[PDB]
Structure formats: C-alpha cells, structure tokens
Amino acid sequence: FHISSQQHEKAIKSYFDEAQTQGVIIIKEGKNLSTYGNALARANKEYVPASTFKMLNALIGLENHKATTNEIFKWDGKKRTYPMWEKDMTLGEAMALSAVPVYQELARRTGLELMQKEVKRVNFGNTNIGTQVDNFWLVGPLKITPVQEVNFADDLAHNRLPFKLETQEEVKKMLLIKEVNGSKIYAKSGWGMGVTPQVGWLTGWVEQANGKKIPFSLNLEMKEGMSGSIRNEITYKSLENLGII
C-alpha cells in the first residue's frame, strides 16, 4: 500500500524481462483495467486463444447437451502427443490436463453450425471460426485480444455470460489451479504452437478470502525451449507483487 506505482510497474516488467520474452498481464479491479509487463502494446492486439478456448468450448457443449460433467470421454487407443492424454477422462480432467483431443471431440459433437452461432452469440474475440470445427481456436481464424480475454474472465467469474448459472458454475469448478493463503486462482493456460510467433496465455481470476474476484489475463510470446510453467510463475509473482494474493 506504501509501495509506489512506479515500483510495481518496474517489478512486473522485470518478471517478463527475466524470462527473456515480451508480454503483458492485464488486471481488472471492478471496472478498471490495468496493463502491466514489458510490452504494453500487446494489450489490444489479436492472438489465437489456443487452449483458453476450452473454457468456452466447455460452456457451449454443456449448455447444448453435448456432454455432461460425469461423462467419460474414452481414449481411442491412438498415440497422443503426451502420455498423460492416453486415457479416458471427463471434461474436467481434460481441462486440467489440457487434453485437446477431448475438446476436439466435444467441438465435433457441437458441430460447425452450432459452434459458429454460439461463438457469435457470446461475442468471443473476432467471433470468426471459419469452416474447420476442430482447430479454429488453435490456428485461426478465431482471434482475441488480451483485453477481451480478461473481460471474458470477468464475465465468467461473475456469471454474466449468456449461459445458465449452472453451466457457468460447472465450468468454473474445472478451473481451480491453485490456492495461496485464503485466495483461490481459477485460470486456463493457452499455448499457440501452430502459429508464428507462438502465443502464451494464462487467463482467469483470483477469488480472495472476502469473496472479491480479480480477473487477469497474461499474454506473452513463447520462445523455443521455454517451459509452459513460466506463464504461471510470472502470473503468481505479479499477483503477489500487487498484493492480490
């Protein structure tokens, strides 16, 4: 509270500087958006959502009865990119493992026509899914800005998306990634590997002990031989530096 704004800005900038990348973290407090990091002009640029799209894919599939939260999506027995994905799992387990095949199956069940209408109805990013129902969030044409991502998180955190309360609660349940002091962090990571440069995301919110929710979206460039966990590490250091956790 005695810490100056200049010092907070310099500290958060230094976390991106030390990771040797370029990025931002946008923090929302009520209606006010604060942009931190070492590349502030990223805030209104469009990037593929990559696996952050699982949040919406889940809302859509549950709302439209394409799956339930208890349903087991069977592994087809084919080799996957990660061994951890070679198993049968729920949507919730697949969210935590970020198992793309499960979410591609969900997207196929939803189908292109319904997916396009639902993405349009929620006004997510540029709202364009093109003609390929199973990869539109990974390689384009769907794009979204870091400001749009944090505003999406804010909407979900406060149950303002146009889905049933229950549907929003089911998906939020799936997004708990960390508890620190009395605070819970709900978020989804994203890593656009099929585009150049690659984009890294961690979008979510903090629920504080008192019940206040502070949405955030980290957005940065993922570089060759960078670990996925740098997204989490920069996020947790930034939130701690600002006294949010």
Ligand X SMILES: *C(=O)N1C[C@H](NOS(=O)(=O)O)C=C(C)[C@H]1C(N)=O
Q: Number of residues in contact with ligand X, rule: CB under 6 A?
A: 11
The verdict on 234 binding ligand X (CB under 6 A) reads: no
Measure CA 17 to chain center.
Answer: 22
Catalytic residue among 5, 51, 98, 227: 51
Nearer Cβ to ligand X, position 175 or 242? 175
Cα–Cα distances in angstroms (integers) from residue 24 to residues 89, 141, 151, 172, 239, in the given order: 33, 22, 15, 24, 13
Instruction: Please report how close the Cβ of residue 18 comes to ligand X at its closest, in angstroms.
Output: 20
Spatial distance between the Cα atoms of 43 and 144, rounded to a whole number of angstroms = 10
Query: Are 16 and 100 spatial neighbours (Cβ–Cβ below 8 Å)?
Result: no
Residue of the chain from 193, 208, 232, 240 that contacts ligand X (CB under 6 A): 193
Residue of the chain from 35, 189, 217, 235 that contacts ligand X (CB under 6 A): 189
The verdict on 176 binding ligand X (CB under 6 A) reads: no
The verdict on 197 binding ligand X (CB under 6 A) reads: no
Spatial distance between the Cα atoms of 118 and 66, rounded to a whole number of angstroms = 13
Interacting span for ligand X (CB under 6 A) from 17-25, 65-73, 112-120, 188-196 = 188-196
Measure CA 103 to chain center.
Answer: 14
Could you give the strand order of the β-sheet that contains 213-222, starting from the edge strand earlier in sequence? 32-37, 23-29, 213-222, 198-207, 183-192, 176-180
Tokens 């604060």 belong to residue: 34
Spatial distance between the Cα atoms of 62 and 91, rounded to a whole number of angstroms = 10
Instruction: Please report how close the Cβ of residue 160 comes to ligand X at its closest, in angstroms.
Output: 24
Residue of the chain from 60, 138, 147, 245 that contacts ligand X (CB under 6 A): 138
Spatial distance between the Cα atoms of 143 and 145, rounded to a whole number of angstroms = 7
The yes-or-no answer on residue 227 being catalytic is no
SS3 206: strand
The verdict on 218 binding ligand X (CB under 6 A) reads: no
The verdict on 51 binding ligand X (CB under 6 A) reads: yes
Nearer Cβ to ligand X, position 55 or 157? 55
The verdict on 100 binding ligand X (CB under 6 A) reads: yes
Give which of 70, 65, 74, 72 is closest to 109, Cα–Cα.
Answer: 65
Nearer Cβ to ligand X, position 186 or 242? 186
The verdict on 191 binding ligand X (CB under 6 A) reads: yes
**Where on the chain is the footprint of ligand X (CB under 6 A)?**
50-51, 98, 100, 138, 189-193, 228
Q: Which residues are catalytic?
A: 51
